C-alpha cells in the first residue's frame, strides 16, 4: 500500500463529491479529501496509474503530486 498525494481545486464543496464519487466508482479505494487546503490524499493498494486515469474523468484541477 503506497500513499499519493494530489492537488484538487473545489470550486464548489460538490466537487470533493465529484472526486468522491469517481474514486468511490473505480472501486475500493481509501482517498480522504481536505478542501481547505485544496488537496486529496490517497492511501490504497489500486495502483496509481489506475486511479490517476479514472480520475481525470471528473476533468477539473485534479492534479498528482506525491508518492510515498
Same mark, same amino acid.
Not at 470550486?11 to 472501486?27: F, I, P, W
Not at 479529501?33 to 490504497?44: A, F, G, M, T
Given at each position: 500500500?503506497? $500513499?499519493?498525494?494530489?492537488?484538487? !481545486?473545489?470550486? =464548489? ?9 469517481? %474514486?468511490? $466508482? %473505480?472501486?475500493?479505494?481509501?482517498? !480522504?479529501? !481536505?478542501?481547505?487546503? $485544496?488537496?486529496? =490524499? ?7 496509474? @489506475? %486511479?490517476?486515469?479514472?480520475? $481525470?474523468? @471528473? ?7 506525491? %508518492?510515498?
Amino acid at each position: 500500500m503506497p $500513499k499519493h498525494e494530489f492537488s484538487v !481545486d473545489m470550486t =464548489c464543496g460538490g466537487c470533493a463529491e465529484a472526486v468522491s464519487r469517481v %474514486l468511490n $466508482k %473505480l472501486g475500493g479505494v481509501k482517498y !480522504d479529501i !481536505d478542501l481547505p487546503n $485544496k488537496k486529496v =490524499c490517497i492511501e490504497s493498494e489500486h495502483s496509481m496509474d @489506475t %486511479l490517476l486515469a479514472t480520475l $481525470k474523468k @471528473t476533468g477539473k484541477t485534479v492534479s498528482y503530486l506525491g %508518492l510515498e
